[PDB]
Ligand binder design. Sequence first.
Ligand code: UPG
Ligand code: UPG
Ligand code: MN
Ligand code: MN
Lengths: 258, 258
Amino acid sequence: MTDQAFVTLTTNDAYAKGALVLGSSLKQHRTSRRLAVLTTPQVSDTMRKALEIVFDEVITVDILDSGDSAHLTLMKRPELGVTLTKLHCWSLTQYSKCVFMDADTLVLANIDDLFEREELSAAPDPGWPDCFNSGVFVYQPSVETYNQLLHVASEQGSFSGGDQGLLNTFFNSWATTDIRKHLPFIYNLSSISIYSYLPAFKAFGANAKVVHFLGQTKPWNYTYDTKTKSVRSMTHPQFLNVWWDIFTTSVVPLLQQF
Amino acid sequence: MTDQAFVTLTTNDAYAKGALVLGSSLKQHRTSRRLAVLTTPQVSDTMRKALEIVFDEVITVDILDSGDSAHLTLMKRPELGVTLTKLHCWSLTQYSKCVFMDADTLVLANIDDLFEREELSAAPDPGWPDCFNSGVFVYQPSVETYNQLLHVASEQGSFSGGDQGLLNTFFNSWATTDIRKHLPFIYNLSSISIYSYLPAFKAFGANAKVVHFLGQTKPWNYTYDTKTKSVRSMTHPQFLNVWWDIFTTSVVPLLQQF
Ligand SMILES: O=c1ccn([C@@H]2O[C@H](COP(=O)(O)OP(=O)(O)O[C@H]3O[C@H](CO)[C@@H](O)[C@H](O)[C@H]3O)[C@@H](O)[C@H]2O)c(=O)[nH]1
Ligand SMILES: O=c1ccn([C@@H]2O[C@H](COP(=O)(O)OP(=O)(O)O[C@H]3O[C@H](CO)[C@@H](O)[C@H](O)[C@H]3O)[C@@H](O)[C@H]2O)c(=O)[nH]1
Ligand SMILES: [Mn+2]
Ligand SMILES: [Mn+2]
């Protein structure tokens, strides 16, 4: 399956660290698919070079450029910068099917079985469960769908200020149609749901395949003691500690060659 | 449909106020079904008499009595008092299909369409969306199912300390099977999801058919100014104010005849 991939996104260096750890986690669990990352010119050349190693393909998108198809739409709704860049994940017509994953996710086990799913497949979002979380989703690249999402972004925008309301408005049958398009929550496990909902977590939380660090606080916003191999501080740091083990073990030395 | 009903529960007087408002909301939106409430001896005679007016049937359950089928199980796991009482909702074999509703819910529109659903149908729980919320669900009374839930309550208990983990463990195919058994979130809208998730709410929150007051703070734990017709105090009190309008308008005067 050379025409299938995991696709992530990073518009800066902080998020590139996430992209790097995520990509490493993917390789660590032996994925048979291609690894792709959408990037912007604002990503440093040192970060960019590390991504060229972790990823099979590094694509460069620049919506600030008048030559991009999303530029006009960025002028009309300038707050949607990250969202419009994200939508270019549907432009990767070199792939037949992809699994989009936020740069703040971490893969804990092989998830190649997601490629059995069809567009649009995604896990429920905690908070408002009739909306799917846009941090992890299965889609099929297409110029027609992309132009269609751009159009909707222009005329309506997003009810959340981010891509989530836009993707839910466009793929509106998700809640009431096809249970198969409802990815098990363990494929996009919100870290907030882990420390908060202790019961539900203690019961199914060990089955987690993908952790999603949703809060204000990303993993790279923590301090990690290298001796003790643990973050400094609240009830379940084991997930932050794995992110840092990967970053410290495989990402940091990789960045030292620059 | 004389053999179909909405079934609620109350083990004391505080929750009976909820049961009373809920039952009134049901009548207010003209339900064609029967109204039933499970009660305990601990419910005052004044509360009991008000329930006999709002409800078509008031059933009395006493698990503290050695003569109840759940008593033995209550001795083995005494923390499950409210849960084991709740499970008697499956003993109401006088009805072919029922919609169980927590005493802390409020019906904002006719929801007779829920009787088209089969057991077990329920809305996703915010927090851990692969588990359904047990505050609103469609089921079919049965002695066999009841004995089966009792058995599971005895051997395993509940992973949440309440009925939710027990019902999810028993009806375990909910997450991955039949999108029809996934009731739209508007049929069991968590009030926490209303004030917290402002975006998602502002977009679909006006479609709400049932509000569920999940917090530590129930509606009866608020102070309601009768002149201004509003609770004293955080972003969306309109739902608390409707609960109090119903309580003040239809429940309080009804209780004065005692
Ligand atoms: O400066 C930025 C910000 C974001 N991103 C990318 O965009 C993704 C989305 O943003 P993130 O910072 O990870 O946001 P979340 O905490 O995951 O949340 C947002 O995105 C979730 C799913 O994507 C939604 O559930 C939330 O409502 C929304 O607030 C990130 O993972 C990155 O891949 C960048 O590249 N650069
Ligand atoms: O002393 C009591 C306590 C509860 N109840 C009844 O039991 C229902 C459940 O309890 P409630 O106080 O309403 O709890 P919730 O805030 O709604 O939450 C609990 O129940 C939810 C769904 O029932 C789950 O999502 C939560 O995890 C669980 O903590 C109530 O509505 C009542 O009908 C009584 O009759 N007497
Ligand atoms: Mn994210
Ligand atoms: Mn409740």
